[PDB]
Structure formats: structure tokens, C-alpha cells
Amino acid sequence: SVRKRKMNRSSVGKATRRNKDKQRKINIQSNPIIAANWDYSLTMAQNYKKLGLRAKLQTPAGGKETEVVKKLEELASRSQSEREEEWLEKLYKKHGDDYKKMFFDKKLNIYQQSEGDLKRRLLRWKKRNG
Amino acid sequence: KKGAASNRTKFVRSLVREIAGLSPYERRLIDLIRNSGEKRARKVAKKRLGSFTRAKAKVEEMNNIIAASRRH
Amino acid sequence: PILKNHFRKHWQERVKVHFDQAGKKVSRRNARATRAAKIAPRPLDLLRPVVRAPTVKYNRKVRAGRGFTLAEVKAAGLTAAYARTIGIAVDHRRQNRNQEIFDANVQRLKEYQSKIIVFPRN
Amino acid sequence: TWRKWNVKVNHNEKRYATASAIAATAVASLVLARGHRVEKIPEIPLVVSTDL
RNA sequence: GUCGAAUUUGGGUAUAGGGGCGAAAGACUAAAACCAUCUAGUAGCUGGUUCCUGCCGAAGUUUCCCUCAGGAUAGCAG
RNA sequence: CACGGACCAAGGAGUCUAACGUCUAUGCGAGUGUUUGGGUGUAAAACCCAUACGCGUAAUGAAAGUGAACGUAGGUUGGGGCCUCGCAAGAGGUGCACAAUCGACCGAUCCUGAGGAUGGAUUUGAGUAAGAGCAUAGCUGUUGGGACCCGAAAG
RNA sequence: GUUUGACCUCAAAUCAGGUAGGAGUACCCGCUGAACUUAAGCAUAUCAAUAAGCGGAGGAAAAGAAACCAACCGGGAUUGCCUUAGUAACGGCGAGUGAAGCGGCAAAAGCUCAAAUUUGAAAUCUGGUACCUUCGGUGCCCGAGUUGUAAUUUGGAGAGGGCAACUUUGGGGCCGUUCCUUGUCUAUGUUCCUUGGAACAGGACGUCAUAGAGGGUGAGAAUCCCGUGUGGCGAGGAGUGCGGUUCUUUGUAAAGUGCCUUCGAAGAGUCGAGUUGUUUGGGAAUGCAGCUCUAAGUGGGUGGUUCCAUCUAAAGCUAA
């Protein structure tokens, strides 16, 4: 070649990268339970059937509870603002439970909200209080 | 739901139709309906436009220009 | 007696010989191994539907489809937007017309939903 | 480069040869004809325990 | 009529110049150098074509598709 | 005649491939072909394989269409072998492959009139008539590629 | 008011800040485009939608989420490989050219604008400028902008309300792991006799071997050296993939599910038609380009024996 001829002749030095052994054996990353139980001497599909998990949901072309219990173990195992709370304080102290009157009030229910919104928000207020 | 009616676009097309006036051939076409009739009107429209189905919709469109302008 | 030889053009410029058949099989298996190393607990492919092939010739055969439908996913008891997060391929342009295909897919979805273990966001 | 390098062989023909090859490992005279210093051994086919 | 003919050339610096037809404008359809590629351009031809022994071993021709070319197809040796 | 040949060394010309075909070898055989791929691998090797696909197992007709057993798959003529008798020669039975001739069925082709019926006669075919192919390898032939090696009046 | 002031358009400035060219070019996207040749001499044709020429990109490019294919018991973005298959179709029906759907497989992923008022509030953005925890954030100011920047909405519809005492929740650190670059450690004879200039040879005796690949060393050296094989210990970065720990979360804030209730637009010198030219396997007139003419919305396109099926053009992005 033209450029390669000079680069193999120059005293600059080649940017040699030996990244061939890293192409075959890539470490499993996304799950530490799988990361501890993965036999690197076995292949991908062999390490799936060893653990139990299905590797391909479509039936493959060609010819083909030890750990899943640990997964099952770790898988079987919204507050209100100061102003919103004080707003619901005002509504309860002036009305109580008359949601028709409570939502037809122009002074406290400035946002013309329904009855269902009011009873839900007040019960959130009542659960967090006495 | 091929060409869903759309009350607004029918209004808009007809709103622009009355404002913009008529193209010089359509201006001849509406004179040609009153004098010579739909026979020669469709003949000129077919030569002017692409196909016969074009000339159907166009002469009828112009007949509705006349039907609204004269009566109502 | 017939024979037709398409060697009238400058054919000798475009001759592709696939010496990399053995190299490219290794390359795809390394790709699968990498993808399964990044997508650790999950299979390697989305859950695909059962589908009847078109044409008088192949309408005997049952094959893999692209995705289910909004109809088959709803009848299974979940939403299309949520199905994709669980790895169920969804086809918006496909239509449901055959009852046997429909029910086979719904049961394929239902058995899938029994066998899975969805991880919490915490 | 577009010379033929690889040779297609029939699969049962390939398995014929591999079976015949196994068949000839326990002959003891073909083993001497092939090479293999096998005079001072008890019997062929030679079999050792699984602990190997 | 007769680049008559360049004599006289240093430096600088331009414009042109190939064909029938046609009044012209224009169009029909032909056919000055060097370098690199297309390019291993086309062969109805010239020249050449690389070890040994054994055994068998021709024809140099009819008829047919006419033919110059382009050759095609019964006999002799297998 | 003419053309080449002063002498020596080294180089120097039927090669590779695609397509189709004959013959032979091999594996399997009404089937056959793993190697597009997938799995696996001691890692371009080897070893496994799902689904399809290719060619073949059915042809005929322009297409629509229809679709190969009346018989022990048929009679007659020959026919390697084998069988019974023959002290042997010879006679008879059975007759494989294959060859000739008279028939049965498929296909399109007309009368019969039951609409197209039962039966009547040929023509077509690289037909059915109890399959023979698929794949790999070798010698090789034809055609296309720079195509046995060097050379041409060039656009 | 014979003045002053809004705009609009067009300029300039060594203004502030940016950006374009050239190289390389195998592949990739375009434009432009032959001939030798091959066909019986030969305007079609062929080589060939090739070479040369010109422009334009990246690690890939291009393509791409149907104005797709089909005719089924229907499939479902693209791209690629096997198959279709030298098939359909084209062609002095000559030399020759020559697909695609289906089936298998590789790989797979989806989305975003314009068009319907935020109108109880341009909610948007660039620059300048002062700080800060700086691929940015915050404050103030000049502007862009209503001839429309934001949020909502894209047909798979979608939106405004009401009903579930329906379900959910963001952002930044730090330290681990992932990756990249880089450093280092990790077995056994130089024991005897002969030949030799030299032992790395022959012979004798032994070792290590998850290391007897390779090279060097005064001739063929696992065991002399570097290495190899197997694991161990570090350093500097990239980063959000996840594992911990930790600091923040808020506002009548942002969603999703099912039902009820009220509404509800979809890309024009474009499709098309004619036409000359190019081009394709595309006879059905296959694509495209120029020129004439130029549409419609129970629209329109594309197929299939009275109709039926299937798409949504003339806007845009997107890995493998």
C-alpha cells in the first residue's frame, strides 16, 4: 500500500490493540444473581437451561428451581403539600361532608372541582391526620 | 369512514369558492350552461380537465353556483 | 438443447464468494451471547403470535406473525403499551378475522403471563 | 479466490466412513499397519475406567 | 488568378483554421500531436505449445441440407 | 523453396469457474440432499438439527379441465437361469432382464341420444401396464467467460 | 403637523458569536454518460442504466413503519441470506435480458410534525450580562416571536367533562460492579559422558506440564532467556447498564386503566390527463424527467372473477 508502507517504516509506532479474546467472553452485567451463577465454560443457551430460564420463545431452527427460587424470593418481597393540606382544612372546617355545598362554594373551591375529587383528597387528608 | 362529512371543511371550501371568484375557464363554463347547456359545457370541461369523472363533478359544482346565485 | 448464460456483462467485477460463512456464523453467535449478556434474565426475542399464511398454496400451514393486535392483547387482559415492556410484540396494522387463530394467540399470551416473573421498579 | 476450496460430502457417506474408522480401531493388525506400538498391551479395544 | 514571398527578429500578447448541401441562416448522416484509462478491444490468419514405454489404430469418401464462406450429416477406427 | 534457429542459464503456454450433458465410482433408495441457517465446538476444522425448499414419485391438453388394473397387471411369439424325467444325448414345466406383434386404463379427439349416457374406431405420449431416482466424487464433452500462450487495420 | 413617531423592506460595520470550502474515497447516496465488443452486413438491441467525468455523506450509507402484498382458513416497516428461479415477463420473440409475492432463516423497534383557541393571561426560545456545584444552572436585561414559539392532539384515533372512595410517580451525588486504556506478579536441568569452534546433537540420568504455541540464544533447546498456560494484585479514565448508601422530592403537579356523557380537521402546479424524451422483466404501457392542460372529499389510490378487498399519498426521524 501507500500509507501502510510509511506507517510500517516510521518511528511513530502502531496503535496496537489486542481485543480478540474479549470478543468471545463478555461478562454478564445486568443481574448479580445471574452474574454469580453463570458457567463461562458453557455457552449462552447452555447457561439458560442450567438456570432453567427460557432463552428463545420461538422454537429454534436446528437440534437442541436452583436459582429461579432466589429470583421469586426477591420479587414476592404519595403525600400532600402544605398549601393543599391547608386548603382541605378550610373546606372541612366550613362545610364538613356536604359535597354539593362544598363544590358550589366560590370562596374555597376556587377551582370548580367535582365531588369525587373532594372526597378522595379529604380522605387522604384524614388518613394522614386523625 | 371514507370521507367523513366534516361540517367545517364543507363550509371552508364553499367559503373560499365564493370569495376567490372563478377561474377564466369556469367563468366561460357558467356562461356556457345558461346559453348552450350542460352538453357542450361537459365537452369543454373534459378537454380542459383530465378525465370524464372530473367533468361530472365540475359542471355540477358550477350548476350549484348558478342554483344559489340566481334563486337563494 | 435450453441454457442461458448471463456472462455478457462485466460479471468478473461483481463476484461475491462467501468464504465468511463460517466466520459470520461465529459473529452472529457472539452477537447473541453479547445481547443475552446485556439483557440477562430475558429470553433474546419478543413473544411472537401464531398466524395463518396467505395464498391457496400455504393456507394449510401455521407460522409466526409479527405481533398480536390491540384486540388480542386486550382480550388477554392487558394494554399494548404495557405488553411491549413485558416483551410482547404488538401489531397495529394486522386484523383479527379468524376465531381459531385469535383463541390460540390469547391462550399463548395467557400461558406466557403465568410463566413470567416481572421485576419491580425498586 | 473463487476456486472451489470446500468439498460437499453426503452425510450418510460421511457417517459410513466415521463408523468404519471406529470399526478399524479394534482390529489390532490395522493398528500395527497404521503405526502405533501396540505389541505390549493386553487387548484391543483398550478400555480404561471412568476415573481417568 | 497565382497561403505570391516572408524577408527580419528579441520580448510580450491575441484571434482563427476540419465536411457534402444551401442565397444565407441552418440542419442531414457521414468518416492535426501526445498521455492515461475503458482494454486481456475484435482472429474467417502467422509463430509456438514442455516426460517415457506398451498396445490398438484410420480416413483422405457417397448421399443429404445448394453454395464462395458458414459448414452441418453415411463409411473407416474404437 | 520460404520462414525460425550465434551460444548458455533461468522463466515460459488447455488453467480456474459457471451452466448444462455422457460414462464410472460411492452413500442412501420411492425417496433423496446436514453445511440458508440454528445448536455445539478442543474453534474457519469436526459433530448434531427444527421448519421449509430443490429434483424425483403422473401425465395429458392451447387452456378450462381430467387423470392410468376387467383379467394371477394380459395374450401370442423368443428368452439367460432353475425345476422333473433322463447312466447321457434329449423332452417337458417354469419362465428374469430384454425384443416383436395383437389388447385393458389416463388425456384430448366423433357417432350413438342416457341432456352427453352403454358401447363402437383409430390418432396423439420420451404415458399406466406393479416404480428408479436423488446426492457426492472421478475421467470427460459442449457452451460462456481474458479462456492454450504472443501478435492486428482501433473507437 | 411644512413636525414628531410607529412599522415594512433593503443595506452596512476588521461589530458579538458562529459556520461552509480542501484531503481521503473500498464500500455508500446522487448527477452525468460513452465506446471497443456481441449479435449476418446492421438506424433498434447488446456491452450498460457499465467505464471515464462531476457533486455529497458515515461508520456504515441508503432504505424503513404501507396511498404494501395478496385473493388466503389471509399475511404485515425496511434490509440481508437460502428459496422462488433462469420461473413470470421483455426481446429482428435473434444475440440475449430477466424480477417479485409466498415459505425458511439472520436481525428486529418504534415513532414525530402540519391541519380543530393557552386565550383565566407566549405557558416558548436565542443572545448579552453577574454569580454558581460549568458538555450546564440561576438572576437581571436586549430581543425573536401572535404572518404563531410552548403544552395537548397524529387514526392503533383523539379531545373536553363526570363516575371509580380504581393504579402509579420525579432529580442529583458518592462508593461498588460494566467497559476502555494501562502496569505488574505467578513451573521445571543449564546434571554427567562422546562429537563438535560453539551444544541447542547423540547418549546417560532426571523434573514441570490448565504451560511440549512461537522467537532468541555460537547447529534440531517444554526444562537457559523472553515468552506460553492458569489465576492473582493494582493505576488512570468512560459511563448510567444495575448493586448499595445517601441528599433532594410538591403542586390543588404529571400521567394510566375501564365505563358514562359531548364533540371530532387528515400534506395541490399535487393526483390525474395528454404529450416528447429516457428507463424497466413490466406486453398490464415499469419508473422518472420536461412541456400543455389540471382535480375531488360518504374522498382518493392500488389490486381482484355485479361488485369486492386492501391501503391513506402529495410532510419528517429511527438501531440491528
**Cα–Cα distance, A11 to A8 (Å, whole number):** 9
What 3-state DSSP class applies to C62? strand
The DSSP symbol for D45 reads: S
Task: Give nucleotides in strand G with any atom < 7 A to a protein C-beta.
Answer: 25, 46-50, 65-66, 70-77, 86-87, 96-98, 101-111, 116, 156-157, 161-166, 169-170, 177-182, 241-243, 250-252, 256-258, 264-266, 272-273, 293-300, 310-312, 320
What 3-state DSSP class applies to A62? coil
**Cα–Cα distance, A110 to C94 (Å, whole number):** 48
**Cα–Cα distance, D47 to C55 (Å, whole number):** 59
| Count of other CB atoms within 10 angstroms of residue C113 | 16
Beta-carbon separation of A26 and C32 below 8 A? no
What 3-state DSSP class applies to A13? coil
> Which class for D25: exposed (0-12), middle (13-18), buried (19 or more C-beta within 10 A)?
middle
**Which amino acid appears at position C37 of this protein?**
A
Q: Please, what's the b/e burial string for B20-39 (b: 16 or more CB within 10 A of its CB; e: otherwise)? A: eeeeeebeebbebbeeeeee
Beta-carbon separation of C43 and A23 below 8 A? no
Q: Where are the domains of chain B?
A: 1-72
Contact with chain C for residue A24, Cβ under 8 A:
yes
**Cα–Cα distance, D3 to A41 (Å, whole number):** 37
Closest-CA residue to A62 (of C29, C84, B69) = C29
What 3-state DSSP class applies to A22? helix
For residue C63, give the H/E element and its range: strand C62-64
Answer for the pair C12, C4: CB distance below 8 angstroms, yes or no. Answer: no
**Cα–Cα distance, C16 to A53 (Å, whole number):** 40
Task: Pick the residue of C13, C19, C20, C21 with the most D CBs within 10 A to test the interface with D by mutation.
Answer: C19
**Cα–Cα distance, C70 to D10 (Å, whole number):** 49
**Cα–Cα distance, C14 to C8 (Å, whole number):** 13
Helix axes A82-94, A115-128, angle to 10 degrees: 110
Which cell is A51 given?
438456570
Architecture of domain B1-72: Orthogonal Bundle (1.10)
**Cα–Cα distance, A34 to A43 (Å, whole number):** 14
Q: Please, what's the b/e burial string for A30-50 (b: 16 or more CB within 10 A of its CB; e: otherwise)? A: ebebbeeebeeeeebbebbee
Residue entry with cell 355545598: A101
